[PDB]
Structure 1
Amino acid sequence: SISQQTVWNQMATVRTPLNFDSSKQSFCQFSVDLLGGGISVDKTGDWITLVQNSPISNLLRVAAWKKGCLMVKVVMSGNAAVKRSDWASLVQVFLTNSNSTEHFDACRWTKSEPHSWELIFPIEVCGPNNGFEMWSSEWANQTSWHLSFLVDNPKQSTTFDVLLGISQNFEIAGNTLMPAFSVPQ
């Protein structure tokens, strides 16, 4: 039973748009598809997003059928230049199994700590195959797990890192053919 303490894997890093224009609207939104490996963003500005090709990130994108628990950790690193007394920002986090607006939320959080905060919670994959689930498959109208954010005042709550930890019971089967993963720099 392979295991080691304190070793998560980086999954994504979303940087709020630098040219966000407060005057148009005050918040902006992005969503991370935890099991499919994609990041979605606003047309609110030029987002700087990135999905790291870490071991867990590569595994999930290529594992056809999944089942079991995963651990999620979100770390918001904000604008250190704002004085603590002028902090006027908050971010709403949502866990939904689909991006469709017709699906209710599995969970919901709202974080507003100044400069930085972290959020850790587990998610579990349950599917119809044999408890296995295929990412957004049309088969039994399967689904995924999306983590959506509504950042209010993107100039203070600027950065988000999403890390994932695999559990002892995570189990997969089958392979999904994917195009080459692009290596940065």
Structure 2
Amino acid sequence: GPVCAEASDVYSPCMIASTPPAPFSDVTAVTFDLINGKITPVGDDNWNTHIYNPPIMNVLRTAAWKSGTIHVQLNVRGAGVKRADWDGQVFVYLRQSMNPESYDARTFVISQPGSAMLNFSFDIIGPNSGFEFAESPWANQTTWYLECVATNPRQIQQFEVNMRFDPNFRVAGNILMPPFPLSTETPPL
């Protein structure tokens, strides 16, 4: 299929993580808390990370109760490697908790030279009235985590998480947050 399927809508860039600098080279992973807006590498940080303040990201961080669908698009940017030497792979895991007892809600497995895009949606539905308060101790509520595994941090450079609310999204209640640091989008050059 040389012909490209038409993309549309406005998906704003929420959070981005870049792999540990050379000579680091073990398989490494970073996990995004899609709802509370938190990035967490596996301990071997120097996974340089960023959280932006697009509208969607501020609603997600101040809205107490949420109910609706979120449309995500993972952009994977890679180092400049001769295609013939490419061996990188990204393993993606969408889950509701990081305890090992929890199972994945969805799993993707991509592997293509340089760049790749992955699109999927998921939807927040809770006990309050189809509303869910991310990890409230209340009905033992939960959040949505996106774990990404870079199989070769020297070839796969960074993961960019783009999100967009479906029109059916609804929100209720406010959360007292500390001030949000300015976080202007790191340019491409």
After the TM superposition, which parts of structure 1 deviate over 3 Å for at least 4 consecutive aligned residues?
A: none
C-alpha separation in 2, matches of 1:45 and 1:177: 29
* Residue number in structure 2 paired with 1:15: 18
> Which structure 2 residues correspond to residues 1-150 of structure 1 after superposition, within 5 A?
5-19=8-22, 21-22=24-25, 26-80=26-80, 82-150=81-149
**What percent identity do the matched residue pairs reach?**
38
> Which structure 2 residues correspond to residues 133-172 of structure 1 after superposition, within 5 A?
133-172=132-171
SS at structure 1 position matched to 2:74: strand
Instruction: Return the offset for 1:44.
Output: 1.9
The code of the aligned residue for 1:85 comes to A
SS at structure 1 position matched to 2:140: coil
SS at structure 2 position matched to 1:158: strand
The code of the aligned residue for 2:170 comes to E
CA contact (8 A) 1:19 1:45 kept: no
The code of the aligned residue for 1:62 comes to T
C-alpha separation in 1, matches of 2:23 and 2:63: 36
CA contact (8 A) 2:53 2:183 kept: no
TM-score for the superposition, normalised by structure 1: 0.92
Distance 1:45 1:173, change over 3 A: closer
Matched length: 177
Instruction: Return the offset for 1:21.
Output: 2.5
C-alpha separation in 2, matches of 1:18 and 1:129: 44
TM-score for the superposition, normalised by structure 2: 0.90
C-alpha separation in 1, matches of 2:103 and 2:40: 19
* Residue-by-residue CA offset, 1:45-84 (whole Å, 9 max, x unaligned): 412100101100011000000001010000001012x100
In the alignment, structure 1 segments of 5+ residues that lack a partner are none
RMSD: 1.2
C-alpha separation in 2, matches of 1:36 and 1:19: 30
C-alpha separation in 1, matches of 2:158 and 2:138: 36
The code of the aligned residue for 2:37 comes to G
Instruction: Return the offset for 1:6.
Output: 2.2
Instruction: Return the offset for 1:151.
Output: 1.1
C-alpha separation in 2, matches of 1:83 and 1:9: 31
